[model samples]
Target chain A: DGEIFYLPNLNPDQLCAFFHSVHDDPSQSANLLAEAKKLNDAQAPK
Target chain B: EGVLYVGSKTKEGVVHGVATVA
Candidate 1:
């Protein structure tokens, strides 16, 4: 199972820009990333 | 038992998404 396949290539500034563009709370992005990784791991091939 | 640790992003927060490591 792969928890996280990829992380958005974004620096602090880029990340912030992305968050605003998506209308998603930037503060939650980190947490959301974590969650995505977790799920990715679940299905990952060992 | 060996466990595979995976992390993910979610509404709740960044968390450890568990799955069988291949």
Candidate 2:
């Protein structure tokens, strides 16, 4: 699954945080953050 | 068909984004 998933406690922000926290590699962190942001924008209600 | 699926784990919902693979 490549799309974004969200829950009551696990919103787009939380999901992104998990991604950011899990990867410590300098390159990975930045890349994941960018990808997470895109998913975040789609997951949360507008 | 190639697709990226985003699904709910609980009593939620699921959505998918499509992607093509070679």
Candidate 3:
């Protein structure tokens, strides 16, 4: 038996890190929600 | 549905602004 836990470790600080890390390029238009959701989904138990 | 987001680092990583494609 396996349990699924949806936990997203995204907060303002983390989000800022993510942006600052990539904000250097003016062409960076990554979706915040999409990234968060993807991370959350990946961590979910199968 | 064309939108772009920008984040400003104040005390932390706070998304303080957004922009839309014209």
Candidate 4:
């Protein structure tokens, strides 16, 4: 359940992070998701 | 039909950004 970030969490900062990592309309959405995954992974308790 | 399928791959409720090949 924690593998992905919910849309509600898609704040302006998150979107900026997504754009910084990847662009291009075709992969934009997917890229954003990946960024979110990475963000979540980092936030996960270790 | 193409190799890139855009769908929910997981039940985490997160939208998919990767193109899943089927």
Candidate 5:
């Protein structure tokens, strides 16, 4: 909801692809960011 | 040698040890 943050447990390759998505593949940026947010929210403290 | 990676040293929490160029 605020800024996209990294989660330590997220897949290593998926994280690699997330950065790739930012440049080589803008098409994937939204989906990858969404997944990052999903994982981030799940780990966020109450 | 050229650096390669599996886990990231890209941040404070994830790296296993000191960051280097590998």
Candidate 6:
């Protein structure tokens, strides 16, 4: 099982957007991972 | 403002999921 691990500070809207993107590309699991990465990077230390 | 309700896929045979934020 590939469990998604990321910072727990993600908002529900962001999470929803990520999933919405995923729904667009179901075969591209990487898309979801990438979104998660983007979400984390947005709040990561500068 | 409280919680979000996320549902399963849709009947259109596409990727569908209802999500709610709290």
When candidate 3 is compared with the true two-chain complex, its DockQ is 0.06
**lDDT by residue for model 3 (A1-46), tens:** 2122222345456445444633554343245334544655655434
lDDT, model 2, position A32: 49
Positional deviation of residue B16's Cα in model 2 after best superposition, in angstroms: 24
lDDT of 5 by residue, B1-22 (tens): 1112224456464531111121
Candidates in order, TM-scores: namely 0.33, 0.34, 0.31, 0.32, 0.39, 0.51
Off by over 4 Å in 1: A1-23, B1-22
**What TM-score does each model's chain B reach against the true chain B?**
0.24, 0.18, 0.25, 0.19, 0.15, 0.16
C-alpha local distance difference test of each model? 0.40, 0.41, 0.41, 0.46, 0.44, 0.51
Location of the lowest summed lDDT over 10 successive residues in candidate 4 chain A: A1-10
- Fnat per predicted structure, each in turn: 0.18, 0.02, 0.00, 0.07, 0.00, 0.00
Taking the tens digit of each residue's C-alpha lDDT, what string does model 5 give over A1-46? 2232444545556546555654464555555566655655666444
Per-residue lDDT of B1-22 in model 4, one digit per residue for the tens?
Answer: 3233122424433343433345
Question: Highest DockQ, which number?
Answer: 1
Q: In model 1 chain A, which range of ten residues has the least summed lDDT?
A: A2-11
Q: Could you give the CAPRI-style class of model 4?
A: incorrect
Candidate 4: deviation at residue B8, Å? 9.2
lDDT of 1 by residue, A1-46 (tens): 3333342333345333433432343444444454444544544443
Candidate 4 stretches greater than 4 Å from native? A1-14, A19-24, B1-22
- Model 4: per-residue lDDT, tens digit, A1-46? 4353343334446545655544344345555566665665555444
- B1-22 per-residue lDDT for model 6 (tens digits): 4443322232322232333445
Q: How well does candidate 1 score on lDDT at residue B18?
A: 32
Best by TM-score: 6
Where does model 3 exceed 4 Å of error?
A1-9, A31-33, A40-46, B1-22
Chain A accuracy of model 2 expressed as TM-score: 0.42
- The better-scoring model by DockQ among 1 and 5 is 1
